[PDB]
Each structure stands twice: as C-alpha cells, then as structure tokens.
Design a protein around this ligand. Sequence first.
Ligand code: NI
Length: 165
Amino acid sequence: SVLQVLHIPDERLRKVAKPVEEVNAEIQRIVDDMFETMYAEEGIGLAATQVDIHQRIIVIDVSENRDERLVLINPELLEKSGETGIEEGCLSIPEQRALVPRAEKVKIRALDRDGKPFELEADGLLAICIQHEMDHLVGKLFMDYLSPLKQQRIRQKVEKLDRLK
Ligand code: NI
C-alpha cells in the first residue's frame, strides 16, 4: 500500500528511529510499502520516520527506470570523505530545495530486505541521498543546515501548501 508522508511542522518527523529487531515478513511488507510510497511520490529516497514508522529502515532508488532498489535496514556509516552538495528536495518538505553540505563519499554497512548484511561504497547523488535518508532516522532534515530565517521561510511555504491541499 501507498503510505502517507508526514510534512513539517509535524513533530513526529523529529523522532529518532529504533533499530530493527528481526528482518521478518512484517519488516519486508514495510519495505515494499515504502518503495510503493516513494515511487508514487516520485522520490529517490524515503525513511520510515517519514511514514511514521520509527525503525531504522530506508529505501532508495536513484535510477531513471526505477529498477535499482536499495534497502538499508539498520544502516551504519563506516567512513566518509570529501565535501559536496546539491540543491536537495524532500518529500517531507514539498517543493522546497536548498544546497546543503554533505560528504562526497560514504561507506556504509546495512541489512538488505532478506536481512543479509552488506557493505556499500557510494559517491555522487547516491552518497548524498544516503546521508539525507540516514538524517531522517535521527530526526534531522536538510533544513536544519540552513540559517534560522531560511528554516522559517521554508516552514512557512510548506504550511501554505498543506493549507491549500
Ligand atoms: Ni527527505
């Protein structure tokens, strides 16, 4: 099923997700629902916190043909290097983009949808998306890196959009 994506101001977006206990059928259904939601919202990443599920689960797909499913369950940053940034969007912050500092490369470990551990070295867009999604699981948003005024501006714009929807 396609799930409801929370938007700021929503305080739930500020929650810190708990680690996943076992990767069972129930976890796998959450993963599958999260992909469905992500794809439907035309997104490249989604964290469980965004759909009010506070467990360390991320889904990502940075491909055009939407057939490269990356699942990060209980992800762990093992190393990062360099610096970069692009103008990032966020399904929890509709229609607002801003450039945000990020590591250029990350190396992470996580469990996949079967519960298998794997390591992944990423760079470019995928590194940035991974960092953005991992920020979600500790209640952090791309807005947090901007000036207090810019946070208020953005948060004002979002509240106006949800009034009209
Ligand atoms: Ni986001």
